[PDB]
Design a protein around this ligand. Sequence first.
Ligand SMILES: COC(=O)C[C@@H]1N=C(c2c[nH]c3ccccc23)c2cc(OC)ccc2-n2c(C)nnc21
Length: 108
Amino acid sequence: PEQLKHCNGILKELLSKKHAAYAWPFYKPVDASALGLHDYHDIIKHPMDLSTVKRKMENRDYRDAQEFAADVRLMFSNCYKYNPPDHDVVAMARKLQDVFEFRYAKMP
Ligand SMILES: COC(=O)C[C@@H]1N=C(c2c[nH]c3ccccc23)c2cc(OC)ccc2-n2c(C)nnc21
């Protein structure tokens, strides 16, 4: 209960303007067609993004904090999985994950 309330606050920061410089690629699902990706959905089997997490939050689909954090980390993993480590989107994912993992750790 109060746990899921904290998760809601974390999500607002990930979407806040303070982190928009490196968090924008994760606002909406990967549009493989718009990006020219031909193997994204064959390799990434369970896509995830901040709007989908926000939706599941609003529909009260998360039962605890652990279920919420599982989706957020999966979002970063898909980015790490599909892209080589030298790509900048991986660096943006690492920057945003360090923000998430820090705030998530400071949860009561
Ligand atoms: C060429 O390879 C790709 O298109 C992969 C794709 N690239 C970026 C991106 C974002 N800054 C970048 C800098 C250099 C290279 C790629 C990028 C991107 C952009 C988006 O804007 C709507 C939305 C999703 C992503 N996104 C995610 C999340 N995970 N992978 C990708």
